[PDB]
Design a protein around this nucleic acid. Structure first.
Lengths: 404, 405, 405, 408
DNA sequence: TAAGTTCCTATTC
DNA sequence: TTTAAAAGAATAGGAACTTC
DNA sequence: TAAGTTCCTATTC
DNA sequence: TTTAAAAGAATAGGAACTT
DNA sequence: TAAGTTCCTATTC
DNA sequence: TTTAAAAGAATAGGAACTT
DNA sequence: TAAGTTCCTATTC
DNA sequence: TTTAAAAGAATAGGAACTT
């Protein structure tokens, strides 16, 4: 992974190699500066500000395809997302003053085709985003409940798994996203060292952790709790920890700490291929449709259909808009916390009262606060000890036994 | 109809037939290239995206009144709505190399202005139209009185009961929802549902997806105190009409038709407009190019402006008012129905709905009806809608109608 | 009044005279086409659309000051509010091609004064927003709006030379305050529209209509019976008797729409300002460029907000609606919002508002509105207004002035 | 202070003193033209509109660090924030004909973004923030165990034994609590008009004390409150200690308007209190955030309340509580009643229903309000708040007086 | 019969 | 106080047929 | 004394 | 999913005094 | 095996 | 009727390898 | 007279 | 912090006249 390489390559060491491809003019030394060219352009236009991993690989792909240098007239050009082609020109010039560079725009979204091309497609389609939303739209409206649709998705990994480790991963990730209404990254980037028990006036306690590197860059919390029924999150967490081990936090920019991350970066690939083939519904058959994002859409729906749509924004970590721009930027130092009655509804021990607005306890023999009171009065999860709070490894352990 | 035939011929046959026309440079084959050309220019400017029926027809006509050519020199021109001409022209020349294509944009001399201004100093179709609309509303009569007169101008002027039925139902339905003809026509029959409203107990709801702006909305029917009762009109309609196969209206030739039936017939609007023109007891209806079936939109819209309730307008009429995955449509607020049902009155001061002293309250009757169970009768009086509209609804309407003397 | 003249001058007759000032190049014939240059420019950029009176005179004043023509090298310069200087150039050219015109922008004449000018002022002010503050403090000083009005109203009684003016000024003021309107909102009223309307509090009321407004959205004007030391009906009575109808002035270069009379004269506002200015019963009227006639509006505005009834303001003041979509307002709205009945109840002083339970509590008094109404229910006192003002009303007003001491 | 003196000299004098400097040019007389120049450049670009104290000072400094001239070639230049340079330069040449004025834009054409100056910096970094270090600490101070109400008690107590006099102890405590309770700035409390105190009723506490502030950073007026609170931290108590130990302050003039419309006679606090307060805070507050150079000091109250609301999922009250612009005889937007129910600590915000729930705790506040409104004729208020007698409505001083004495 | 249809052209959202 | 120009997608009207 | 002030310069809204 | 550049107006820090 | 990985490229937030 | 175009960042896919 | 008018110009919606 | 610039339309003012 070259982006990693770059991060290691020294700046001056870079500005050098770049100038070393023009004194020895060739179609082999220039046609490879792709990555360097990218890194350069960024720092130039952003005044030496770091660049994130994904943002780079995207801009990199673009150059590769728009790269064109003049054989012997000494000209050069490519596509790059900038509104300052001018200055970038003047800057690139003062590097290899013997050439003339040109920055071409990126309209990637829309490209005109050849009539014979357009026609060929049309004829094909004749004899043979939107679609995706419709499919999911219909699924929800067909006998099965979110809770049932999840069960089929969850169980469908049971016997299709080659190893026992993957079965444990996939199965975890899914249930993970659904519960926290999160993305893949929201689950992967979790900092294990942050697991800790928090209280709740319904389930007694719960497991909490933190994610910092998110898409909106607004950190959030991730939870794991006790569910009454044929599915118990704590159980899948348990099975997860035992067959899995810590992961060295990857570097994500040309720049603070955090050495570990709850999951692997490529896990998402095998998870997509899994759902793809082992598809328990037609929606996963659609190309470019939702795969891992499914866990989020699912919990999204579940909450809206209960009227509790407002509760969605919080759980999904939607960027706030009510508070003024500056107030969010320099005065907000604590993130919004998920309300206590949220988990009561997802733990299945309670139900929501759309009218009087209350959490009605569902008649059951297993009381969450009591199974809590007994286990209240270690090294079952090796590899995670010394990293994950003992306080928690202790809680988890005794729960797996006390409750059949 | 042209568009329908066009939706049938395969893309490759469309091109062939087009190139075919210029191999034997003859006026006869070229003059008929308008539909083909229209289809072609779109697919070029939209990289293969489907074309809608209405849009196609509109564009075709613009070409037909503008198609000009010269067989000697081999040049051809015409008008078309677009910015990207060069791309288009070029693209066309490719297909047919020996010809030169010129696209003319379908889109203020000081003297032409001075003349018109002068010709005016000595002596609109819209101005005269608004004038009349203002009057029809300003004068004595209220909206509800105006509705009763229009709705009755059909009672003894129609040829068959079936047409009497549709004309009455379609008008009441456009006024009640502030909807267009298409808003009611494109309704999916299988979508009828019983939804509860805290003022009337229950309300009948149906959905429409294929709408002018492509933004879905609901269509309703409910009880109303007085001589004009929507449910009654719904009743007469259902017994005298049948479902209609959904007409396809996109060249998408997609495997995703989904909607099987539609509520009314596309051609109904033409006969309805004529009846209205020859019988409505208002002068507005005799002004060339003036609102006809679109009258119910003008009526309801105005009603709300007067009642100082313009906050319900965009949502009732479905206009744009400045979590996309699996989108859900904005619902119309319950009070709206309390008002239009005529059972309640809107109180300015408190901004609340006040029931009327009038004896029998609607929430009550709803209960008396929800009670008695097992009324398979619904199925007997609405045979042609059996299996399409939920049994729950036909049984309800059936019960409401029979329980009212 | 030249604008009036223009309106009468024929278009071609104008395009002519304009070209007749360049064949005879002079500093006398060109320096006077100020008005023609204006009329031309407009129709040019607006594609021959009429122009309003006030809009014209504003643009006119601008040219006057920005006029500059080249002595002998052919060309003209002036300021004119347009975003199409280009086309207006090409048009103006094809009139007197022998010249080169130039359109200069207009920046609210915010011309950086000369330092010596700025300094001079500063030094002056040294040895020697504000308006809003004053009015802000007045409301917060013992006296009530009703008291502040009384002092303003009475302050005209003796300061007035004749008796007709005392009647006018005194009417206008109370007028605006009651209808929360501007001057034009009261002036343009069409007398022929007076009519009695009902109210579940005062029994009946007098209503009329204004069409030519600032926002162009017509509105209603009212006059009713007030309990206490001030009774609007009384000032109306006194108004009609000493005043007479006015020929509606023409306000644009149009058409054939009509209205022959307007409730008041155009220059009345002048003598009304000078009156408040000198006879100023408060310091706020002493402020230059401050509110004069607009005071009646600001006053009623405050009165209403202080009663929590701020929402009720928008309606009474005829504020442009924004909730309903642009097109919905433009082509479907044919009836204006009506002032709520419980409004006048509060301004008649017979009732009071109940901020809590939200009700109109009747104030214990011997004189009942509806009863003084019931008796007068079971002519030519206002001559000159008969045949123009509905007899129905002249009859109502008359008998009220008497039955009531 | 320069500004004050400038508000005293007549316009004709300044301009005179100024031009004088260039007629018989001396190095000493020119270098002192900064204040005069500032004033002049503003009055030119604003056609005589008044200049504010802070703005004047800020602009003066930019000129002082940039004034350059050639007495020989009679040329002078400097920096100044404006678009209209030509107009300004020209105007200046008029006043002094034999000189050439050149205005240099105080800007951000951004760092002279030299690719190499950047490569150097990026490199110097690859081998080896104030804004960043500051946020970091703020996040921690809130994330950890302690709650806002516990953090408030500790900061508020860091003044109890280190204050030299009781008067300062009193101000520091009051000022902090007031900035947190209203999510306001120092100026928001300082500029309060003492004569505007009023008793307003709130449906949760019965009554609330309200005062007004007009001269604010964005020039949009707002209210400032004080009320009862269940627990060890009670605003009214702190209000009580302040009033008894301080006195009114003559309104300082802060505009060159030299207007006859001063209106406001007194102000609540002293402009210079912020400096002594900031120091006290820097040496004693029990948190590391307080030791970071250029970090929030008196502005800490704003950060605390703001955050509290975000956490409580009540960001709909933020802009109105802190007085930020929210894209919509003027009247100011009032703060919703529930806000005070929450902060008073007598009620709790219920998420599910979104309603305020009183706490089982015995004595309800609405009740006591009644027991107090009862007994009449307590001229006592006038006795314990002498220095505020005649300035603050008798109604209020009698109320506070009764509240404080009726609490054991 | 002429109200209703059908299939485009002209107009207005 | 109000503000636009142009591709898209309906609704209204013209002729010549159809027919409970 | 060493916290408090006063009157600008540097920084951050 | 988010998006700015620059005139205006505060708050925080530095020295040298005061009380 | 044929389910998992790598490491970019293509699409969708 | 309806109306922003781009920059900044994750989530699917493609194709050759690995176990 | 000095409160009203005329008829544009200057300001404020 | 806060943030649009202009076109389109009435409401005050200025100065010479009129009763």
């Amino acid at each position: 992974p070259q982006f990693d390489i770059l991060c290691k390559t020294p700046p001056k060491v870079l500005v050098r190699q770049f100038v070393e491809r023009f004194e020895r003019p060739s179609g082999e030394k220039i046609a490879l500066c792709a990555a360097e060219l990218t890194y350069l352009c960024w720092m130039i236009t952003h005044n030496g500000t770091a660049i994130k991993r994904a943002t780079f690989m995207s801009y990199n792909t673009i150059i590769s395809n728009s790269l064109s240098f003049d054989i012997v007239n000494k000209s050069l050009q490519f596509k790059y997302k900038t509104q300052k082609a001018t200055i970038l020109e003047a800057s690139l010039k003062k590097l290899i003053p013997a050439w003339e560079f040109t920055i071409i725009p990126y309209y990637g979204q829309k490209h005109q085709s050849d009539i014979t091309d357009i026609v060929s497609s049309l004829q094909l389609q004749f004899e043979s985003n939107s679609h995706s939303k419709k499919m999911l739209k219909a699924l929800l409206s067909e006998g099965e409940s979110i809770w049932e649709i999840t069960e089929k998705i969850l169980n469908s990994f049971e016997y299709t798994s080659r190893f026992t480790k993957t079965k444990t991963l996939y199965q975890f990730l899914f249930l993970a996203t659904f519960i926290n209404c999160g993305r893949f990254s929201d689950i992967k980037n979790v900092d294990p060292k942050s697991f800790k028990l928090v209280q709740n006036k319904y389930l007694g306690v719960i497991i909490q952790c933190l994610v910092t590197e998110t898409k909106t860059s607004v950190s959030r919390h991730i939870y794991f709790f006790s569910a009454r029924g044929r599915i118990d999150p704590l159980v899948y967490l348990d099975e997860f920890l035992r067959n899995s081990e810590p992961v060295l936090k990857r570097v994500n920019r040309t720049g603070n700490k955090q050495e570990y991350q709850l999951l692997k970066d490529n896990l998402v690939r095998s998870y997509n291929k899994a759902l793809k083939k082992n598809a328990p519904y037609s929606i996963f058959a659609i190309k470019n449709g939702p795969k891992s994002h499914i866990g989020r859409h699912l919990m999204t729906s579940f909450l809206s259909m209960k009227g509790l749509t407002e509760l969605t924004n919080v759980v999904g970590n939607w960027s706030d808009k009510r508070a003024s721009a500056v107030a969010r930027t320099t005065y907000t130092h604590q993130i919004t916390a998920i309300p206590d009655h949220y988990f009561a509804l997802v733990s299945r021990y309670y139900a929501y009262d759309p009218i009087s607005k209350e959490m009605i306890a569902l008649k059951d023999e297993t009381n969450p606060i009591e199974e809590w009171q007994h286990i209240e009065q270690s090294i079952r999860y090796p590899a995670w000890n010394g990293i994950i709070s003992q306080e928690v490894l202790d809680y988890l352990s005794s729960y797996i036994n006390r409750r059949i």
